[PDB]
Short mmCIF file of all heavy atoms in Angstrom, two decimals:
data_model
loop_
_atom_site.label_atom_id
_atom_site.label_comp_id
_atom_site.label_asym_id
_atom_site.label_seq_id
_atom_site.Cartn_x
_atom_site.Cartn_y
_atom_site.Cartn_z
N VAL A 13 23.19 16.91 -17.28
CA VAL A 13 24.23 17.65 -17.98
C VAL A 13 24.12 17.26 -19.45
O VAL A 13 24.43 16.14 -19.82
CB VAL A 13 25.62 17.31 -17.44
CG1 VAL A 13 26.70 17.93 -18.34
CG2 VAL A 13 25.77 17.84 -16.01
N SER A 26 6.74 6.14 -0.60
CA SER A 26 6.27 6.95 0.51
C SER A 26 4.90 6.46 0.90
O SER A 26 4.14 5.96 0.07
CB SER A 26 6.25 8.42 0.15
OG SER A 26 7.55 8.93 -0.15
N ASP A 27 4.57 6.58 2.19
CA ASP A 27 3.22 6.23 2.65
C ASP A 27 2.25 7.12 1.96
O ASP A 27 2.47 8.30 1.76
CB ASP A 27 3.13 6.32 4.16
N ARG A 39 -5.51 9.37 -7.17
CA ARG A 39 -4.71 8.23 -7.63
C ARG A 39 -4.56 8.31 -9.16
O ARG A 39 -5.57 8.28 -9.89
CB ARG A 39 -5.35 6.90 -7.20
CG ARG A 39 -4.57 5.68 -7.60
CD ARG A 39 -5.31 4.42 -7.14
NE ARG A 39 -4.70 3.22 -7.68
CZ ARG A 39 -5.11 2.60 -8.78
NH1 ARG A 39 -6.15 3.10 -9.46
NH2 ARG A 39 -4.51 1.52 -9.22
N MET A 53 13.76 20.62 -15.14
CA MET A 53 14.84 19.88 -14.44
C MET A 53 16.10 20.70 -14.37
O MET A 53 17.03 20.35 -13.62
CB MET A 53 15.14 18.57 -15.11
CG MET A 53 14.03 17.57 -15.26
SD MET A 53 14.72 16.21 -16.45
CE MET A 53 15.79 15.18 -15.17
N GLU A 106 -8.64 21.98 -7.48
CA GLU A 106 -8.00 22.91 -8.41
C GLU A 106 -8.05 22.38 -9.86
O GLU A 106 -7.76 23.10 -10.81
CB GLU A 106 -6.56 23.22 -8.02
N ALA A 132 -1.60 25.00 -28.65
CA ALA A 132 -1.75 25.25 -30.09
C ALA A 132 -2.86 26.25 -30.41
O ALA A 132 -2.68 27.20 -31.19
CB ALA A 132 -2.06 23.92 -30.79
N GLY A 174 5.12 21.78 -42.51
CA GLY A 174 5.71 21.24 -41.33
C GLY A 174 7.20 21.04 -41.43
O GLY A 174 7.76 20.98 -42.55
N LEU A 189 -1.77 13.79 -41.15
CA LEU A 189 -2.04 15.05 -40.45
C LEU A 189 -2.50 16.20 -41.38
O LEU A 189 -2.88 17.26 -40.91
CB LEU A 189 -0.81 15.47 -39.64
CG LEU A 189 -0.34 14.49 -38.60
CD1 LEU A 189 0.85 15.05 -37.81
CD2 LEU A 189 -1.45 14.05 -37.65
N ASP A 196 12.26 17.68 -43.94
CA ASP A 196 13.12 16.95 -42.99
C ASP A 196 14.28 17.83 -42.51
O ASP A 196 15.16 18.16 -43.31
CB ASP A 196 13.64 15.69 -43.69
CG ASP A 196 14.46 14.78 -42.79
OD1 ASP A 196 14.74 15.14 -41.62
OD2 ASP A 196 14.80 13.67 -43.25
N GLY A 213 6.91 32.86 -49.06
CA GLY A 213 7.33 33.30 -47.75
C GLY A 213 6.53 32.65 -46.61
O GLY A 213 5.71 31.74 -46.85
N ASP A 227 16.86 29.36 -37.53
CA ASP A 227 17.81 29.97 -38.44
C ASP A 227 17.42 29.79 -39.90
O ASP A 227 17.66 30.68 -40.74
CB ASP A 227 19.23 29.38 -38.21
CG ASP A 227 19.88 29.87 -36.93
OD1 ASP A 227 19.43 30.89 -36.35
OD2 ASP A 227 20.84 29.24 -36.48
N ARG A 238 3.85 36.73 -38.00
CA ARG A 238 3.60 36.56 -36.57
C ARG A 238 4.30 35.30 -36.07
O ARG A 238 4.27 34.25 -36.70
CB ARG A 238 2.10 36.46 -36.29
CG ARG A 238 1.32 37.77 -36.42
CD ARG A 238 0.97 38.05 -37.86
NE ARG A 238 -0.03 37.11 -38.33
CZ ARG A 238 -0.36 36.89 -39.61
NH1 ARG A 238 0.27 37.50 -40.60
NH2 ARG A 238 -1.32 36.01 -39.88
N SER A 246 15.23 22.76 -28.82
CA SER A 246 16.56 22.47 -29.37
C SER A 246 17.69 23.00 -28.46
O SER A 246 18.83 22.58 -28.60
CB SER A 246 16.72 23.07 -30.78
OG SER A 246 16.90 24.46 -30.71
N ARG A 259 24.47 37.43 -32.67
CA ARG A 259 23.45 37.72 -33.64
C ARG A 259 22.18 38.29 -33.05
O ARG A 259 21.16 38.43 -33.74
CB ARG A 259 23.13 36.48 -34.49
CG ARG A 259 24.32 35.86 -35.22
CD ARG A 259 23.82 34.68 -36.15
NE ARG A 259 23.10 33.72 -35.32
CZ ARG A 259 22.03 33.01 -35.72
NH1 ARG A 259 21.54 33.20 -36.97
NH2 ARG A 259 21.46 32.17 -34.89
N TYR A 287 -10.80 28.22 -21.68
CA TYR A 287 -10.87 26.74 -21.70
C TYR A 287 -12.15 26.26 -22.36
O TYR A 287 -12.13 25.31 -23.15
CB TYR A 287 -10.85 26.14 -20.29
CG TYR A 287 -9.55 26.25 -19.54
CD1 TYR A 287 -8.44 26.88 -20.10
CD2 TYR A 287 -9.41 25.73 -18.27
CE1 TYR A 287 -7.27 27.01 -19.39
CE2 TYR A 287 -8.23 25.81 -17.56
CZ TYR A 287 -7.15 26.46 -18.13
OH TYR A 287 -5.99 26.58 -17.45
N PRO A 317 11.08 7.50 -16.75
CA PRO A 317 12.37 8.09 -17.10
C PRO A 317 12.89 7.72 -18.50
O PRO A 317 13.28 8.59 -19.24
CB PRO A 317 13.32 7.56 -16.00
CG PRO A 317 12.43 7.38 -14.84
CD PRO A 317 11.11 6.88 -15.41
#
Side-chain angles (χ1 to χ4, degrees), chain A residues 13 26 39 53 132 174 189 196 213 227 238 246 259 287 317:
Chain A
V13 171
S26 297
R39 181 181 172 265
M53 300 169 80
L189 301 184
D196 185 354
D227 287 342
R238 287 82 70 196
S246 76
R259 301 186 304 144
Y287 292 1

